[PDB]
Design a protein around this ligand. Structure first.
Ligand SMILES: [Mg+2]
Length: 219
């Protein structure tokens, strides 16, 4: 049976995308740029902070100095850190707390494999820290998803090989990272988005220990 579960944060345990979006929208409003809405925000997902800011600036064909670019980028982050102060256990996705409990009671290791620079803060605000055996530090990892490095790091940190593990992800890049680490992916969302070759559940309430076991036995 699998020995560990490697969780992404955004789209699996909670929604951080909301708070990035709010941070960019508030930034854009502050400097008088219109059009940073939830649809436009699709162009900012999975994209570097530099690239995102550049796209926002283009909406008003606004030009900045290097010093101003740096300040705006810092301001987005300040915005983000302010907006996540509101996170609480009420923000945990359905099924996830029960899944963590059941994993822990079955002595299955639990690790976070997230690019979030605020992972430990977020898990603490959601009162989940006690379930996690490790959090992979994205600062100590060389390449982002779809590279497998973060999932490898998360497995190793709990003393397992990725091939002994299940990875939970909602994104294409994350699923590919899990695949290339050697872990078994189980996606959450739509096969239209994530592919027909993996097991996908429509929402996180379907991530139960019983279901993970059945998927493992059937792989
Ligand atoms: Mg995700």
């Amino acid at each position: 049976m699998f020995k560990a579960v490697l969780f992404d944060l955004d789209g699996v345990i909670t929604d951080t995308a909301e708070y990035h979006f709010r941070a960019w929208k508030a930034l854009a409003e502050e400097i008088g740029i219109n059009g940073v809405d939830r649809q436009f925000n699709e162009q900012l997902k999975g994209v570097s902070r530099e690239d995102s800011l550049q796209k926002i600036l283009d909406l008003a064909d606004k030009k900045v100095s290097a010093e101003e670019f740096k300040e705006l980028a810092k301001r987005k982050n300040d915005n983000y850190v302010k907006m996540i102060q509101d996170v609480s256990p009420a923000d945990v996705y359905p099924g996830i707390l029960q899944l963590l409990k059941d994993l822990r009671s079955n002595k299955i290791k639990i690790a976070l494999a997230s690019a979030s620079k605020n992972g430990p803060f977020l898990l603490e605000r959601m009162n989940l820290t006690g379930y996690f055996d490790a959090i992979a530090d994205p600062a100590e990892v060389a390449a982002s998803k779809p590279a497998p490095d973060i999932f490898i790091a998360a497995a190793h940190a709990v003393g397992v090989a990725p091939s002994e593990s299940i990875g939970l992800e909602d994104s294409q890049a994350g699923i590919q990272a899990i695949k290339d680490s050697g872990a078994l992916p189980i996606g959450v969302g739509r096969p239209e988005d994530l592919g027909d070759d993996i097991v996908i559940v429509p929402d996180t309430s379907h991530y139960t220990l019983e279901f993970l076991k059945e998927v493992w036995l059937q792989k």
